[PDB]
Design an enzyme around this catalytic site. Sequence first.
Site, PDB file in Angstrom:
ATOM      1  N   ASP A  64       0.867  -1.324   0.020  1.00 26.33           N
ATOM      2  CA  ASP A  64       0.081  -0.048   0.234  1.00 26.33           C
ATOM      3  C   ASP A  64       0.954   1.258   0.075  1.00 26.33           C
ATOM      4  OD1 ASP A  64      -2.859   0.731   0.289  1.00 26.33           O
ATOM      5  OD2 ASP A  64      -2.413   1.448   2.396  1.00 26.33           O
ATOM      6  N   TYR A  66       2.164   4.944   1.365  1.00 21.29           N
ATOM      7  CA  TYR A  66       2.046   5.916   2.369  1.00 21.29           C
ATOM      8  C   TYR A  66       0.904   6.683   2.465  1.00 21.29           C
ATOM      9  CZ  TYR A  66       6.876   4.153   3.176  1.00 21.29           C
ATOM     10  OH  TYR A  66       7.994   3.290   2.976  1.00 21.29           O
ATOM     11  N   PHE A  77       8.246   2.046  -0.639  1.00 22.39           N
ATOM     12  CA  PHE A  77       9.175   2.198   0.257  1.00 22.39           C
ATOM     13  C   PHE A  77       9.898   3.495   0.212  1.00 22.39           C
ATOM     14  CE2 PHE A  77       9.574  -2.639   0.193  1.00 22.39           C
ATOM     15  CZ  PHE A  77       9.190  -2.718   1.388  1.00 22.39           C
ATOM     16  N   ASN A 123       4.354  -0.968  -5.878  1.00 26.99           N
ATOM     17  CA  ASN A 123       3.228  -1.300  -4.791  1.00 26.99           C
ATOM     18  C   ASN A 123       2.076  -1.881  -5.439  1.00 26.99           C
ATOM     19  OD1 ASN A 123       3.915  -0.004  -2.198  1.00 26.99           O
ATOM     20  ND2 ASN A 123       3.592   1.831  -2.862  1.00 26.99           N
ATOM     21  N   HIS A 187       9.634  -8.976   5.792  1.00 25.96           N
ATOM     22  CA  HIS A 187       9.309  -7.589   5.622  1.00 25.96           C
ATOM     23  C   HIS A 187      10.462  -7.032   6.535  1.00 25.96           C
ATOM     24  CE1 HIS A 187       7.475  -3.723   5.303  1.00 25.96           C
ATOM     25  NE2 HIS A 187       6.951  -4.259   4.192  1.00 25.96           N
ATOM     26  N   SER A 189      10.131  -4.180   8.173  1.00 25.84           N
ATOM     27  CA  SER A 189       9.422  -3.699   9.307  1.00 25.84           C
ATOM     28  C   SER A 189      10.110  -3.978  10.529  1.00 25.84           C
ATOM     29  CB  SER A 189       7.909  -3.944   9.364  1.00 25.84           C
ATOM     30  OG  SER A 189       7.430  -3.515  10.371  1.00 25.84           O
ATOM     31  N   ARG A 195      13.286 -11.718  11.592  1.00 20.25           N
ATOM     32  CA  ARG A 195      12.805 -13.029  11.108  1.00 20.25           C
ATOM     33  C   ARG A 195      13.533 -13.412   9.502  1.00 20.25           C
ATOM     34  NH1 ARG A 195       7.007 -11.345  11.939  1.00 20.25           N
ATOM     35  NH2 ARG A 195       6.680 -11.560  14.194  1.00 20.25           N
TER      36      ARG A 195
END
Length: 223
Positions: A64, A66, A77, A123, A187, A189, A195
């Site tokens: 999505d 920003y 990004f 996106n 991701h 984030s 991870r």
Amino acid sequence: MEFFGESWKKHLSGEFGKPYFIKLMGFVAEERKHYTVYPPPHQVFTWTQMCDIKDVKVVILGQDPYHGPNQAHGLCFSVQRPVPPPPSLENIYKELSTDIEDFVHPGHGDLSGWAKQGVLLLNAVLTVRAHQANSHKERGWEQFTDAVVSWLNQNSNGLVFLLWGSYAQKKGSAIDRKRHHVLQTAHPSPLSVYRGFFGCRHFSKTNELLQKSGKKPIDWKEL
């Protein structure tokens, strides 16, 4: 289509006349009558203006745009000055500083320099209502960006797809791994960076893969 790169328009023009797309453009037009929608009209397709469609070498899939003021400008990004790099992008720069030996943090989050080199920063959903995350999902954008990924999948060879996170991995599940290179991880984030994203070394791996197919590597420091 206006503000849409010529080389891209030539190959994806067929999408413009399909019912879902015509409905989508109508929906977005209606939304702009009643709300502030990002990115502004001239930046919805920035990803088609930065390089010729046949120069695309690497694809990074986002979800999505920003939803805050002045942040989204048509590339996943990326944020333009003077907006500071979001947490996810700071994590991308962190990985780059340990992965690519000559990487220098530019102090901004504008990834135009990568887009100019053939890194498609796409996106899945290309517009958003101001301050409302995901407000424009499932209105037609996903079919359009699936069509863009499908076109690249069939008409190009040896592209590198970077699939970070659940959404990108699902959207990229149809990529032909016999014709293209697919690198996957978590991701960037803060919530999921540990991870697998840290240590993924996707940037050097991408350049190694590009060379093996006879493509010019990405100069990641060139921002």
